[PDB]
Ligand binder design. Structure first.
Ligand SMILES: C[S@@+](CC[C@H](N)C(=O)[O-])C[C@H]1O[C@@H](n2cnc3c(N)ncnc32)[C@H](O)[C@@H]1O
Ligand SMILES: C[S@@+](CC[C@H](N)C(=O)[O-])C[C@H]1O[C@@H](n2cnc3c(N)ncnc32)[C@H](O)[C@@H]1O
Lengths: 511, 511
């Protein structure tokens, strides 16, 4: 019962993935967004703060949460969002026509009647050019998760209390990690890791009630068949890399490319890759979508490539073409790309100081062009054009319709309204950034964001945080777990401050 | 659509696992054996030839098969066996009470009503000390088989031909064996193998009607649940090694040993080992079974350990404890065991000349004591006593209630009546041995067995086969590639003869 944002749900990501396929979706700046199964609305409210001219509606069956959502909407003072306590089946054509309909993690947990109704409202209540989003669990991938859920019910059947039946399942998952300690068999690998990721989870799914729930257990084509019954058509997935073919032998790529149905192509890919989950984008049946995508399409979007250089800029010469420089993707150990070309090296160093900041094609191109003394522009353009889209379809590069943001002022840092409201008034250990992603903080950053407005500067902010450490409410961790009253504060804050402002500036927490 | 014997179904194997657990099952020599879903009865008739004083009944729904069964029963002239074309549902209480009821690979393919009936007839028609056998596909193991079968139907629907849609799925399993050519991922392993053993299967399993069939998809505890409704109790599995614990951390063995339930012990092992199949032995609820098994219980049975030494006896000294001798189990490279102990060396060299010939504890012990110069009797006994049961519950050693057989006479070898009928009048490349196992023969072996009666000897048998090669009907080629004159044969017959009499003598094909 903690409401998280899901960045894959952002209406801007749907407008972008549509724009990539040829549909012009409504503008998000002023739109109608619907959320089926909202509450507590952490996937809705942060949008209503950033877009005051759009209209947000949300629907849920738990009154407990719909009241909490309204408790936050009342604290932030928003007029553009309203939450309704009712069921999806209660939505007629009078609700209006929405530009983006977001259904996340519900349609597989509800009875067939509610399913048919969701498929209806994604037709009756969807605009002419609008877009619908539905996430669900698929087969075969879910076969393992179902199995574990059965293995826990069969065990936890010997215990009754809701306080006894949970830690029990948590002890059965440990018992599984013990009996499989020494196993070569390739199956005990999947079971070992899936019980490790289920054991890491907390108490919500693990309640023996949620384990009794039956899942729609879709196959992608059964889902699409119920979708075409309602005159909807498959747009794309929200992870474009899941649609990536090849990374596959070329005779099979040719075969699949021969068949002209994308649905039984994605089905096959589901069968051979053991897909367990899908985030599907649906659009009205009357739209003509274009699947011929070429490198030159990279100019229609703004680009985000989060790469951390392996050596600082002033420490290298880009024209050294024998030097093989490598960059790490949001991280890292391994997960890296190495280039020896001066133009690709100039582009990645531009992407490495713009982290999580959309950049147009002329901004990436011109800003990489001044590291090369303004002479090499056409060679920069020619490498971006060539490798770009190819890297967008593999997932490494993110495209967006969101505009570039002005580099923040770090004199007196200033964060967004949503994260000051989450830092001051909220028990949660994470905040929502401008990209609609939850990012973690440890009580120090949270307290810092409490005081980060365009007013308090470095000194003032630290003295306030210190104010918290006295009444604390505030520990000092390090290596560590000790604080000496004076020598472990105000000399330990000035250390952690600069890099934390780094993390904020590069994670889109500063406006 | 070829009738095969299943050695794991032999009433003597059930009488043996029962004896092992404390139940005295009826004599197999004269009993009442039932088979649900028998025809064409290749799993029944070979028993009716060896036990003329026992009564065999079988039931099947295919007249096409019951006609063949009845024709083979007519060709052998058997009065002790009768086949009925009817349904399991057509069974009265008037059918009698059978000492062994054998249901192999049906209960998962039949509607819930027929399942109810099978569990019923395994109660009302089973004797007081009798035993029932039911094999079925289980979960989780079957999930993969379900996936693949769905993967074929969804594919093969684009054409409706019973002759097209088959070689179609045959080419889809190839499209699967290709697109996974280079893959590390362990799921592509499971899928790689499961499509490989499915493509090796031929034209029947793939019939696309039998892909349309739905499986009961049992869990062991759901099966034991329908068994206890009918007052049946779990006896054991016909693969004793599947009930073996550890191979498992001793804390996990202790934990399972704490809860006393055999059903949820086998259920948890089914969960962690991904059990796909079960051959279950059921017995009446009123019986007291003993699960305490001690090393010295190996004296109640007769022993078969098929080991092929790596060195001839005359080539080694058993008394040398510095020599590490290696033995191969039914084969082989790979599966083998090496021992340096002189007593285990005398026991394994005693089991290696008795292959597939049950041997009592005093025969193994007395014959292994004469290899050590008759000084070691109590040391041989104590090593058999110790390692025996431990190796029986692991699968390496076979126990049986069947008696030792008199060493056959190789002057004029004489094979059993069942394989003479199969050699002469059946176009099968395999015959059924005395242990009820199908064993292959190649065109030479078949022709040889045609003439093996207690009359024809070496020269005569060879002249007969030579006669065949003249009219042949028999192509004899060395590699070689077309021997073939006159005494380049009869010199190839005296060659192929001796190793074949060895092969027959140790496969229980010679009486
Ligand atoms: C299965 S939960 C998933 C919650 C959330 N989207 C997530 O995973 O983070 C679905 C949410 O939908 C709401 N819900 C369930 N059934 C509904 C229905 N029939 N009509 C409207 N809302 C419903 C519930 O309050 C529940 O919190
Ligand atoms: C899987 S095959 C049986 C295999 C069995 N393990 C054997 O080979 O001895 C299923 C056979 O069972 C028979 N059968 C199917 N349904 C039956 C029913 N309801 N009653 C009796 N026999 C049935 C059919 O004749 C079919 O040939």
């Amino acid at each position: 019962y903690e409401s998280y944002p899901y960045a894959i749900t952002n209406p801007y990501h749907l407008s972008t993935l549509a724009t990539l396929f040829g549909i012009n979706a409504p503008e998000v700046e002023n739109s109608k967004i619907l959320e089926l199964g909202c509450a507590a609305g952490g996937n809705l409210i942060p949008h209503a703060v950033l877009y005051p001219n759009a209209h947000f509606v949300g629907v849920d069956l738990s009154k407990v949460q719909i009241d909490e959502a309204n408790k936050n909407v009342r604290a932030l003072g928003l007029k553009n969002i309203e939450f309704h306590h009712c069921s999806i089946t209660d939505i007629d054509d009078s609700f209006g026509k929405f530009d983006y309909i977001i259904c996340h993690g519900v349609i597989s947990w509800v009875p067939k009647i509610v399913r048919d109704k969701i498929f209806k409202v994604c037709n009756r209540n969807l605009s002419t050019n609008g877009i619908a989003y539905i996430s669900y669990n698929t087969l075969p991938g879910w076969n393992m998760v179902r199995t574990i859920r059965d293995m826990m019910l069969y065990h936890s059947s010997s215990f009754t209390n809701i306080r006894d039946r949970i830690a029990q399942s948590r002890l059965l998952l440990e018992f599984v990690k013990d009996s499989l300690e020494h196993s070569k068999t390739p199956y005990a690998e999947v079971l070992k890791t899936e019980a490790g990721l289920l054991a890491k989870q907390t108490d919500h799914y693990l309640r023996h009630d949620h384990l009794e729930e039956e899942n729609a257990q879709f196959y992608f084509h059964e889902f699409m068949n119920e979708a075409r019954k309602h005159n909807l058509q498959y747009l794309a997935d929200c992870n474009i890399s899941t649609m990536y073919l090849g990374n596959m032998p070329p005779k099979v790529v040719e075969q699949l490319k021969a068949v002209n149905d994308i649905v039984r192509t994605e089905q096959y890919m589901d069968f051979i890759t053991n897909r367990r989950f899908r985030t599907t984008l649906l659009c009205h049946n009357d739209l003509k979508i274009n699947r011929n995508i070429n490198n030159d399409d990279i100019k229609k979007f703004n680009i985000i490539f989060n790469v951390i250089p392996e050596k600082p800029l002033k420490e290298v010469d880009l024209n050294n073409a024998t030097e093989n420089l490598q960059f790490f993707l949001n991280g890292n150990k391994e997960s890296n790309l190495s280039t020896t070309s001066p133009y690709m090296k100039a582009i990645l160093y531009t992407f490495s100081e713009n982290l999580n900041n959309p950049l147009s094609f002329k901004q990436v191109t011109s800003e990489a062009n001044t590291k090369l003394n303004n002479t090499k522009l056409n060679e920069i353009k020619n490498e971006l054009l060539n490798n770009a889209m190819k890297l967008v379809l593999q997932g490494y590069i993110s495209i967006t319709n969101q505009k570039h943001r002005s580099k923040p002022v770090l004199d007196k840092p200033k964060t967004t309204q949503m994260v000051i409201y989450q830092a001051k008034y909220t028990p949660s250990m994470w905040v929502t950034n401008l990209k609609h992603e939850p990012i973690g903080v440890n009580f120090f950053e949270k307290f810092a964001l409490r005081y980060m407005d365009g007013r308090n500067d470095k000194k003032a902010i630290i003295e306030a945080i210190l104010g918290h450490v006295e009444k604390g409410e505030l520990t000092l961790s390090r290596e560590g777990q000790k604080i000496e009253n004076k020598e472990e504060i105000r000399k330990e804050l000035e250390s952690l401050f600069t890099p934390m402002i780094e993390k904020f500036c590069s994670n889109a927490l500063l406006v």
